[PDB]
Design a protein around this ligand. Structure first.
Ligand SMILES: CC(C)C[C@H](NC(=O)NCc1ccccc1Cl)C(=O)NO
Ligand SMILES: [Mg+2]
Ligand SMILES: [Mg+2]
Ligand SMILES: [Mg+2]
Ligand SMILES: [Zn+2]
Length: 890
């Protein structure tokens, strides 16, 4: 394979100052004419001029109106257009090309493509080169003048980045519109849209300069009523960036557009953000609760990119985390502020410690700033995004709010209108750090290892108390496992947010403090500690690490009950469950391997179960928090602690634990399920698409979690409750009725009822597909075959493909069937999908990431499917790189 290395970055020998496009959309072809006003840079050494250009049909090429000819002045191999250096001018010049492309057949959803009846672009990372020739890299910044023409009847709305400066009629029923984007930008931020779109709009007045900005949100006609919450969340995002960061929007207009066919969530094209319809469109009658959270976060995310990615952009793709990690952090701060519930931060932690930690212990492990790539697309990872966000968040933890805001402002101002690197950000933070410490010798040089060093640190603790001296010490060690990226690991700068809880009364003993661990180990000593404490460690999840608290289950129970920090409470509960899981897992595993006729299991701690009941029954405790405590840790979290994992033994483990707890708590669970009904399903705001009560949503989450527990338990007469729940006006409730009915004969009747309620809304049908796919059904393989034949069919919509298959892959017992038939099925779907959408094909590989953690028979089966995929002729470079890295071949 063809490998790019971070160390080999060099500025181009060329400059592209202005781009002038004419994009003429016809029924069976789109013609792109482009003039690049170019120059020679200070770095030029008389090299050939090489443009990226993939799958383009050339009509004409010229320089300064001189036609250039293939074989004589240029070559083109379907990937790169080479102009021989003799024909490259030595000062300012105009490069012209006209090419033909075919959006109607572009099923990879990169470049210019057709989504239902909308023509739309996606250029990040390497898609602009599929539209026209460019030096397609983020340091090549230019200004854009864009004309789009099309049939007026078919495509009455035409959008590109920036100010619409003209609109005109064209003979033969066509029309045009011209856009001028005054902000310099890399080509990955170019966008165009053409369709029969409807919109909602509002005017926003900026807080400091009082600029009027027109906000438009667009969709196809059928779903225009599903746009309101998106528009509200944009207003919220604009206000937050003003209020926290002092940042105002910088154009007269901002458009958000929903399209049905999209590879990921959304894209931050300047003044023209394009979204997966699943991350922009909702209505309370036709969307599950989690849609509202998703839309809020994705609209926020794309909005926050306007500074962290757009106004300050990337020097090169190795810097991706500078924009994504930072924008995820911004989005997470925003989400926490808007939702005002502790479950928000917990959900982010849960995602990191399950999905991102698994990736970091896998053969795909990379630092948040990678050293190399074949296909840059494979580096849009949970590591880059979510671990990057936690690295971006640690600066806030270390600095505090005032000095964090100072450093961020230094960064955003110094680098405005330009490219930047991870170092520039660390430098700005270091300036703030020097001011905070009042010491111009302080530095964050060590901090850079968070960018360069892969893997998750393990942080462990020992404690000692001296009652005569009233003195307490916390001794801390960090360790990062060696891996293929560094054979020797270095200690990081780990900030440890701590409190100390009095076990006697459950109250705080110190002002919260942030310990700055910089060595491989250190002991932190506290005076005037009047009794032996229980430490409250890594409050807020203050660094992205494995925590070994070295606490007894009794001490963990006391934190779960009485500590003030939601993460530490949650983590204490997590740790009690993990100890029990590992113990019971080993018990079942030994009995299976030894063919024992009889053996013991360690029961669940009875004092823990009493604590869960105390929490659940406390009407003033948090409903979203309650849903986390009654749930075991996610399977992908658990698998980070087990080697050679027998998935069926784990499935048996989890069932034993759940049954133990339900045998004590099911009556409490029932009583709560009923008591919660009035407040949970209250219809206040049911007609208001501008407001969501997140606490009330968490109450529904808790009710549906309890209902799942009680349904799996066959609690007496619970089928009645399930039938009543299916008549709720909330889709979150009536789709839950479907999956919980899996344990009863009523399953197929509820399957039909909910299908009928879902089938006329594209996005609701997808939620129905997921609900079926994750259903705990012994006949799930036959249900999947029915979904394929009756609903999915030959759809190329990534949302449909992902809906049908990904939830099923989380079915621990059935996806991991010892025959390998799960593995075979998903490998077939990956190979099928790779023939038209390589990016979605790599997304569908996600279940294979843990292959080398499994028992040796399941390792072998997975490995055989991965090698079969790798032998597929015409495998994409995306899928081939991914799979070669994953199987330790690259
Ligand atoms: C929606 C998320 C998951 C990602 C989104 N990024 C993109 O739309 N990037 C283009 C892309 C995504 C995934 C894999 C490859 C590529 Cl090039 C983003 O960061 N938008 O701001
Ligand atoms: Mg082509
Ligand atoms: Mg997010
Ligand atoms: Mg469809
Ligand atoms: Zn992003």
């Amino acid at each position: 394979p063809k490998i790019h290395y971070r160390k080999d970055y060099k500025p181009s020998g060329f400059i592209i100052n202005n781009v002038t496009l004419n994009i003429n959309i016809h029924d069976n072809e789109t013609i792109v004419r482009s003039v690049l006003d170019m120059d020679i840079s200070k770095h030029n050494v008389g090299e050939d001029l090489v443009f990226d250009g993939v799958g383009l049909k050339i009509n004409e090429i010229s320089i300064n109106n001189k036609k250039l000819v293939e074989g004589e002045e240029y070559t083109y191999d379907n990937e790169f257009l080479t102009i021989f250096s003799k024909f490259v001018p030595k000062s300012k010049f105009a490069f012209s090309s006209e090419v033909i492309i075919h959006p109607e057949t572009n099923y990879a959803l990169t470049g210019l493509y057709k989504s239902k009846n909308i023509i739309v672009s996606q250029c990040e990372a390497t898609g602009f080169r599929r539209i026209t020739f460019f030096i397609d890299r983020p340091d090549m910044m230019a200004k854009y003048d864009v004309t789009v023409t099309a049939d007026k009847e078919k495509y009455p709305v035409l959008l590109s980045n920036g100010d619409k400066v003209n609109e005109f009629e064209i003979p033969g029923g066509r029309h045009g519109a011209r856009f001028n984007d005054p902000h310099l930008k890399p080509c990955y931020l170019f966008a165009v849209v053409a369709g029969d779109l409807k919109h909602l709009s509002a005017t926003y007045i900026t807080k400091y300069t009082k600029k009027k900005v027109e906000l438009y949100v667009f969709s196809e006609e059928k779903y225009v009523s599903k746009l309101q919450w998106a528009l509200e969340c944009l207003k919220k995002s604009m206000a937050f960036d003003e209020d926290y960061f002092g940042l105002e929007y910088d154009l007269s207009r901002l458009n958000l557009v929903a399209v049905s066919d999209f590879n990921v969530g959304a894209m931050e094209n300047k003044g023209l953000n394009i979204f997966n319809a699943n991350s922009l469109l909702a209505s309370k009658k036709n969307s599950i609760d989690f849609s509202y959270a998703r839309i809020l976060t994705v609209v926020g995310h794309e909005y926050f990119h306007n500074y962290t990615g757009n106004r300050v952009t990337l020097r090169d793709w190795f810097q991706l985390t500078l924009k994504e990690g930072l924008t995820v952090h911004r989005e997470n701060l925003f989400s926490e502020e808007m939702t005002k519930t502790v479950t928000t931060r917990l959900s982010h932690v849960d995602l990191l410690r399950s999905v991102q930690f698994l990736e970091d212990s896998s053969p795909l492990s990379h630092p948040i700033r990678p050293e190399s790539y074949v296909s840059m697309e494979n580096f849009y990872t949970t590591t880059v995004y979510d671990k990057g966000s936690e690295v971006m968040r640690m600066y806030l933890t270390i600095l505090g709010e005032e000095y964090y805001k100072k450093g961020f402002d230094i960064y955003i101002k110094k680098n405005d209108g330009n490219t930047a690197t991870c170092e520039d950000f660390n430098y700005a933070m270091e300036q703030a750090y020097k001011m905070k410490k009042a010491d111009n010798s302080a530095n964050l040089n060590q901090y850079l290892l968070w960018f360069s060093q892969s893997g998750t640190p393990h942080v462990s603790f020992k404690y000692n108390y001296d009652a005569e001296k009233k003195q307490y010490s916390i001794h801390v060690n960090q360790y990062t496992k060696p891996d293929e990226n560094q054979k020797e690991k270095k200690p990081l700068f780990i900030p440890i947010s701590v409190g100390l809880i009095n076990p006697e009364n459950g109250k705080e003993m110190i002002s919260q403090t942030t310990l700055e661990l910089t060595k491989e180990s250190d002991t932190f000593v506290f005076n005037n500690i009047a009794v032996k404490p229980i430490p409250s460690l890594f409050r807020g999840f203050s660094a992205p690490v494995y925590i070994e608290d070295n606490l007894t289950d009794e001490e963990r129970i006391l934190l779960l009950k009485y500590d003030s920090d939601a993460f530490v409470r949650y983590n204490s509960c997590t740790n009690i469950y993990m100890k029990q899981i590992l113990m019971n897992y080993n018990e079942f595993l030994k009995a299976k391997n030894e063919k024992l006729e009889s053996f013991n299991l360690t029961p669940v701690n009875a004092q823990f179960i009493d604590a869960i009941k105390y929490l659940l029954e406390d009407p003033h405790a948090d409903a979203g928090f309650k849903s986390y405590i009654v749930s075991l840790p996610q399977d992908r979290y658990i698998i980070n602690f087990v080697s050679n994992l027998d998935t069926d033994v784990l499935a048996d483990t989890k069932e034993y634990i759940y049954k133990q707890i339900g045998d004590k708590l099911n009556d409490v669970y029932y009583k709560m399920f009923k008591s919660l009904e009035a407040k949970a399903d209250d219809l206040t705001y049911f007609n208001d698409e501008s407001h969501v009560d997140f606490d009330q949503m968490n109450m529904r989450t808790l009710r549906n979690t309890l209902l799942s527990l009680l349904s799996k338990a066959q609690y007496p007469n619970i089928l009645n409750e399930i039938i009543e729940h299916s008549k709720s006006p909330y889709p979150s409730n009536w789709l839950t009725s479907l999956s919980v009915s899996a344990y009863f004969d009523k399953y197929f009747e509820l399957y039909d009822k909910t299908y009928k309620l879902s089938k006329d809304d594209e996005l609701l049908l997808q939620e129905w597909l997921k609900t079926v796919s994750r259903s705990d059904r012994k006949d799930i393989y036959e249900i999947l075959k029915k979904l394929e034949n009756e609903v999915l069919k030959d759809s190329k919509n990534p949302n449909d493909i992902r809906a049908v298959y990904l939830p099923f892959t989380n079915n621990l017992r059935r996806f991991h069937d010892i025959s390998g038939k799960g593995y075979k099925l998903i490998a077939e779907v990956i190979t099928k999908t790779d023939k038209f959408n390589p990016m979605v094909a790599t997304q569908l590989c996600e279940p294979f990431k843990l292959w080398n953690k499994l028992d040796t028979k399941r390792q072998e089966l997975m490995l055989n499917e991965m090698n079969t995929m790798l032998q597929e002729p015409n495998i994409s470079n995306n899928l081939k790189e991914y799979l070669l890295r994953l199987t330790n071949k690259l």
